[PDB]
Amino acid sequence: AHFKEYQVIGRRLPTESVPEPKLFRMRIFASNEVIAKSRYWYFLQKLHKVKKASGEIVSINQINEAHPTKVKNFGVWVRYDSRSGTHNMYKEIRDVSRVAAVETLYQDMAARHRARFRSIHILKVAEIEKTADVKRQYVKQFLTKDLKFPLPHRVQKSTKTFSYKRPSTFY
């Protein structure tokens, strides 16, 4: 859906042999708290020997964007499962916030590789603080000095089923 980012902090259940476990923390892009906690336990079952019955979640907090009106370039490292194997990819997206960047990332992977939400693993997402570290041409195209371009062929959708003059596509 429209994604939100949460921090989820959890731990193992405390025993007498070891009280105070190590309080692992992860950042999850998810639609809501339930999906966020499910993905948290999914990745902790991939990492450490723990499961939901043997552990607990001590905190979940929404992390909204610090500057939601700054235009950033993000580099995203992704695992995905194809029909024959597992691959790593690095894609970079020029967008205004992290949740919108990963939303366009999920759309981009589903469009160009037919990869689903169950197949995509988000390794990391990070803002590229400096230009000329941008490595893709499709985003390096929009970083030029005095960028301007026209929008040819305007199509205006009509409300009536009949129009009384030939329309114009000037913009």
Binding site: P152, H153, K157, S158, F162, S163, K165, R166, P167, T169
Partner: peptide, 17 residues
């Protein structure tokens, strides 16, 4: 008489150039 068009069936408005 007066001739009309249907803008949701016009080629210049529907097809990609």
């Amino acid at each position: 008489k007066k001739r009309v068009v249907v803008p949701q069936a016009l080629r210049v408005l529907r097809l990609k150039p």
